[PDB]
A paper describes a structure:
The largest interface in the structure is that formed between the Ubl domain and the rest of parkin, burying ∼2,150 Å2 accessible surface area (Fig2A). The core interface is stabilized by hydrophobic interactions mediated by I44 and V70 of the Ubl domain and L266, V269 and T270 of RING1 (Fig2A). This interaction is supported by several key salt bridges and hydrogen bonds including R42 (Ubl) with D262 at the N-terminus of helix H1 (RING1) and R6 and H68 (Ubl) with N273 and D274 at the C-terminus of helix H1. In the Ubl-bound structure, the side chains of H302 and E300 (and H227) are facing into the interface, while in the R0RBR structures, these residues are flipped out ∼180° away from the interface (Fig3C).
Parkin is an RBR-type ubiquitin ligase which is characterized by RING1, inBetweenRING (IBR) and RING2 domains. Parkin has an N-terminal ubiquitin-like domain (Ubl) that shares 65% sequence similarity with ubiquitin, and a zinc-chelating RING0 domain immediately N-terminal to the RBR domains (Hristova et al, 2009).
Numbering used by the authors: 1 to 83, 144 to 353, 355 to 356, 361 to 382, 391 to 405, 414 to 465
The structure:
């Protein structure tokens, strides 16, 4: 039997398998061929992962079936009881999603001298420019607006070393199951569909990579290229396109080239099949021999294999579970003062509490029950 494998490409190479071939054996074939460790490969068929112990027969794979192989090792270990509210994409040295550190400065002088009127309580407070007011303590600075910024929390960072905040990503303290895999994972990405469908980051990576391989990204005139909720919910395209950086450098670079590749294809062009040089080529409309040239092998335009004369070889190239979708919906009192023990109610999302008792006036963290400090401020200034 011949199956087609798409690995970091929109072109699927043929692989010979038998009814008794396991998915693990298929991964071993692709591992040696690509020089990539076998235990890092994931096989995806019609938007679903195929398990190592399943055979080709168990999977119901037929002649000319297209499977995706994506390089992403499964990591079981996670932190379900995490305290952090925020996530950033650290572009150096982590090169991945990490818990973030929230900081504030004066939007005028850029010093950490802005005394906020009140602490932030929501994403809008820290993402929308000039939303929060205060007074700058620096001599003669008329600064009245706060400027928030985030940094990676996994290692020290300079005051200039910012990382982009990932507003869709949240600590899964609600223990909501993933829409695709039904597992309870943390952190999760929350789609902005009406149902606020939840996806784990492992599934989100597989979703994006297979959609890059199938060239199924959606073009929005006032947005660019993006993806909606995996369930196909209306008006759910990701607007904050920096969320695609969480796929890592190799995959984000493929995403960045999507538009230029789509323009070439729209003009009757073709993308080069060779792994490494996947450039948008513009040959002569009726020419079968396509040679790679702007600024490497000569391929047959029909079968996408090395240029041959005569016939091409005979060999040539999703719905979410209803109950899983309903379960994966993100949105479906008083504490004593740590010092004077007088109970107080938290009015909003801000974790910075201040005891109203005149002899006490202790500033404390609602979550930790400790005196307010820079660590609590950076890690969980407000609830998300
Ligand atoms: Cl976040
Ligand atoms: Zn980092
Ligand atoms: Zn200032
Ligand atoms: Zn999942
Ligand atoms: Zn949805
Ligand atoms: Zn080429
Ligand atoms: Zn051919
Ligand atoms: Zn008190
Ligand atoms: Zn705290």
């Amino acid at each position: 039997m011949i199956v087609f494998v798409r690995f970091n490409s929109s072109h699927g190479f043929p692989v010979e398998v038998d009814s008794d071939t396991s998915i693990f054996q298929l991964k071993e074939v692709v591992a040696k061929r690509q020089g990539v460790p076998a235990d890092q490969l994931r096989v995806i068929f019609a938007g679903k992962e195929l398990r190592n112990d399943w055979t080709v027969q168990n999977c119901d794979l037929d002649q000319q079936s297209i499977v995706h192989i994506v390089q992403r090792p499964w990591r079981k270990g996670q932190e379900m009881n995490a305290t952090n509210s925020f996530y950033v994409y650290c572009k150096g040295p982590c090169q991945r999603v990490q818990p973030g550190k929230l900081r504030v400065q004066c939007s005028t002088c850029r010093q950490a001298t802005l005394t906020l009127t009140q602490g932030p309580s929501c994403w809008d407070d820290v993402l929308i420019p000039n939303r929060m007011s205060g007074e700058c303590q620096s001599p003669h600075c008329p600064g009245t607006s706060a400027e928030f910024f985030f940094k990676c929390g996994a290692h020290p960072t300079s005051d200039k070393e910012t990382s982009v905040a990932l507003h869709l990503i949240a600590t899964n303290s609600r223990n909501i199951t993933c829409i695709t895999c039904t597992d309870v994972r943390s952190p999760v990405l929350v789609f902005q569909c009406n149902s606020r469908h939840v996806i784990c980051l492992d599934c989100f990576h597989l979703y994006c990579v297979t959609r890059l391989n199938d060239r199924q990204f959606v073009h929005d005139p006032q947005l660019g290229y993006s993806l909606p909720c995996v369930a196909g919910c209306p008006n759910s395209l990701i607007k904050e396109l920096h969320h695609f950086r969480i796929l890592g450098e190799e995959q984000y670079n493929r995403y960045q080239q999507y538009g230029a590749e789509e323009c070439v294809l729209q003009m009757g062009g073709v993308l080069c099949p060779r792994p490494g040089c996947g450039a948008g080529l513009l040959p002569e409309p009726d020419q079968r021999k396509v040679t790679c040239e702007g600024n490497g092998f000569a391929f047959c335009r029909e079968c996408k294999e090395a240029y041959h004369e005569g016939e091409c070889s005979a060999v040539f190239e999703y719905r979410v579970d209803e109950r899983a979708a309903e379960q994966a919906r993100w949105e479906a009192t008083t504490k004593p003062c740590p010092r004077c023990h007088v109970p107080v109610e938290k009015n909003g999302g801000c974790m910075h509490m201040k005891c109203p008792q005149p002899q006490c006036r202790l500033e404390w963290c609602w979550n930790c029950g400790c005196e307010w400090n820079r660590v609590c401020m950076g890690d969980h200034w407000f609830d998300v």
